[PDB]
């Protein structure tokens, strides 16, 4: 299970409680294994909001439903190659040097994420993904994991800070005696 | 002012039906603030958590308006104002290790549990306080998990920020003392 992309990206969002607006969102793309028996290859696309921890949308693209998916979007790429394609596009948008935009529009418990090139005449669509809002179960899991992760990271930070403070304090303490 | 009187981990004798009777570390958290049906009644929150299980969350929201009944039932001789001071002092003593009192948390069987501070003499197990904590629902749990997540992320950032500062501040002090 490898994580191909974790970053924050600026996104044109239509959400009914709010107004149409351009917000930063977290996009996460992890390839792994899953499905009804944990045997089918999978690509996860997860959309999150750094300002709202209860905002969580995911698409679990099962390899067995990829043919239909490939055809509907008229892609010319393996299941193997698809995330590479998607991530490259997102990364370009994230890294700021790109002509493409991201749109996330609600429609509720489903939302569509689109990579769009905007020319003079037309808004050209390069990909469209339907992400499902996650239920309490999956959200709790997400929140838990994040919490555990950042706590763990916070500990590690302090641990290695104490190490370094001491390592250099001894190098200050030896330059002082000499 | 919503003030946090105690956040610490304390060793606790626990009866929980999925597990065996055992002495685990648990997180006790005592925050005084304001709340209730209209957000106007003074409140004391006691929260019990498990560092090993993020889905374990038990809380008592002691409303000042139901404290008289509470005070009588436990036969306390303390204000609502003084009560948490009392409770926290006891817990802190137990946490500090310099204490004759123990903590007991026992579940039912599964959404209520009782937390007791107990002094064990030769003849009797004397009870100094008993609190009933309610397991919290997905709503309150998600809120908890969210807050913790945000907090530790925020803290993790701050740690790194001030680490980079210090590494540089001392590396410059290593970089200057060697040449001089």
From TrEMBL, chain B:
Q: Which organism is it from?
A: Leishmania major
- Covered range within the whole protein? 130 to 314 of 816
Residue spans crossing the bilayer: none
This chain's protein is named: Uncharacterized protein
| Domain Spindle assembly abnormal protein 6 N-terminal intervals | 17-132
The chain positions of domain SAS-6 C-terminal coiled coil read 138-180
Q: Where in the cell is it found?
A: Cytoplasm, Cytoskeleton, Microtubule organizing center, Centrosome
């Amino acid at each position: 299970p490898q994580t191909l992309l974790e970053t924050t990206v600026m996104v044109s969002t239509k959400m009914p409680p709010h107004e149409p607006q351009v917000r930063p969102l977290g996009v996460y793309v992890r390839t792994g294994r899953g499905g009804p028996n944990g045997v089918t290859r999978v690509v996860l696309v997860r959309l999150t909001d750094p300002t709202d921890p209860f905002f969580l949308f995911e698409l679990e693209l099962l390899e067995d439903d990829y043919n239909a998916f490939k055809q509907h979007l008229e892609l010319l790429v393996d299941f193997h190659g698809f995330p590479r394609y998607l991530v490259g596009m997102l990364r370009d948008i994230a890294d700021g040097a790109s002509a493409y935009e991201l749109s996330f529009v609600l429609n509720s418990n489903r939302g569509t994420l689109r990579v769009l090139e905007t020319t003079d005449e037309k808004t050209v669509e390069h990909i469209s993904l339907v992400l499902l809002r996650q239920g309490d179960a999956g959200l709790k899991r997400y929140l838990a994991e994040r919490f555990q992760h950042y706590e763990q990271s916070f500990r590690a930070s302090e641990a290695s800070r104490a190490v370094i403070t001491a390592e250099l304090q001894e190098k200050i303490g030896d330059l002082q005696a000499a």
